[PDB]
Structure 1
């Protein structure tokens, strides 16, 4: 049993996230549900106190193996199992700060555990990330291409909505590296439509978020694959 056969739904998730932003150290944990392909939720919470940054910005740090792929595009993230992969992200909040994250994953008993680190340095202390002035981030299309002999790269531009209805941009890039000692067949260049929605639990006492991601792959631009050898 490998690849897509390891992702029979429903499944669950856990996260352990150790973070630091502008020298403010924090920890997040969470548990989540993946009812079906491409729809995955996570109820996270700060275990150190209040989260010292926007929950909207931390949303993408908070599981691409749960994205929904058609049969005719390789689901690289699922095909990495068994063995797993690492994810390394850079998120540049333009004019604000840059953060990085590193993710390791393990699958056991239908549950993917993410162990993530986040490091953010140089953020504007009056910016929207630190002041928690974002309402949501808009849905976007993430470009996925082969990268190196055995990886893939994900890129996106994110529009972050401030309370005043205006936008701030983030630029996001990730590299995905199989860690399983084996070559995983790269997909053709394609895109992932991603929507992140956040709400609060009616009763939880912690600083927390209840987040849902919808992530659906498609060959949006058939010609794109020719450009990536």
Structure 2
């Protein structure tokens, strides 16, 4: 599994969404460099204007590209499930607002890592921060807290995204996550740990379509056994 991620790997992302009955599609393309934990993608709304803010889709739009330190290689569920891949599900609860439910398959198709997603959003406030587009076009750094789920031969994760709001307030989005392998084979079931994630959103000044350019870094941490020799 891990050997598939040496070097730079092309990435395809496809999302079909329905938020409060507003249907939309997103296509993303780019590269991941798991040795450096680096992602670079560009996303387009293929159906017109995106009816929610781009930042609210970042977490949904490939944690197999995390850089796991050498002393933690045996806790990398995501790569261990490759190439057959895994199913990733979330509930994303926007504080004082609606909910996204997402289901994704993350897997290799040839040499390409593909993330194919269905997203359903309900109970959003028509004039709230999301459907009213009051979120700033930026992103904070976050930790993703991971635990094994032996019963499903996979993992769970929990975290809270903080979305800056135009009025200086913060919009919280609580994430609950479950991943399960697509194949029947063994996977690595990790000890508790987390992914440290950083993101930068930008625009392509030559792009006329509704879009998002994304740079992300992801690195795993939170297991310290055993790194003694690395200090000197």
Between the aligned partners of 1:203 and 1:133, the Cα distance in structure 2 is 25
Residue 80 of structure 2 contacts residue 187 of structure 2 at CA under 8 Å; is this kept in 1? yes
The DSSP-based 3-state class of the residue aligned with 1:65 is helix
Report SS of the residue matched to 1:197.
strand
**Is 1:211 matched up with 2:214?**
yes
2-structure distance, mates of 1:169, 1:11 = 32
Offset at residue 220 of structure 1 (A): 6.1
Aligned residues: 220
Q: Which residue of 1 aligns with 2:230?
A: none
Give 1:147's aligned residue.
149
Residue 226 of structure 1: aligned partner: none
By how many angstroms is 1:109 displaced?
4.2
Distance change (3 Å), C-alpha of 1:142 and 1:36: closer
Q: Note if contact 1:55-1:132 (Cα within 8 Å) is conserved in structure 2.
A: no
Aligned twin of 1:65: 64
Q: CA contact under 8 A between 1:76 and 1:186: conserved in structure 2?
A: yes
The answer to whether the Cα contact below 8 Å between 2:83 and 2:107 also exists between their aligned partners in 1 is: no
What are the within-5 Å matches in structure 2 for residues 1-229 of structure 1? Answer: 3-37=1-35, 38-73=37-72, 74-135=75-136, 136-149=138-151, 150-219=153-222
Distance 1:144 1:36, change over 3 A: closer
Distance 1:133 1:42 in 2: 24
* Contact in 1 for aligned 2:33/2:65 (Cα 8 Å): no
Deviation at 1:195, TM superposition (A): 1.4
1:20-69 deviation per Cα after TM superposition (whole angstroms, max 9, x unaligned): 00001111111012245311022001111001101010111110011110
What's the secondary structure of 1:137's corresponding residue?
A: coil
Structure 2 residue matching 1:129: 3-state secondary structure: coil
Match of 2:113, SS state, is strand
SS class of match (2:68): coil
TM-score computed with the length of structure 1 as normaliser: 0.91
Contact 1:190–1:221 under 8 Å retained in 2: no
Provide the rounded CA distance (Å) in 2 between the counterparts of 1:81 and 1:171. Answer: 28
- The alpha-carbon deviation at position 148 of structure 1 amounts to 3.1
**SS of 2:3 mapped into structure 1:** helix
The alignment partner of 2:64 has SS state of helix
Which moved further from structure 2: 100-109 or 56-65? 100-109
SS in 1 for 2:131: helix
Which range moves more in the overlay, 171-180 or 211-220?
A: 211-220
Deviation of 1:137 after TM superposition, in Å, equals 3.1
Secondary structure, aligned partner of 1:56: helix
Task: Tell me how far apart the structure 1 counterparts of residues 194 and 180 of structure 2 sit (CA, whole Å).
Answer: 18
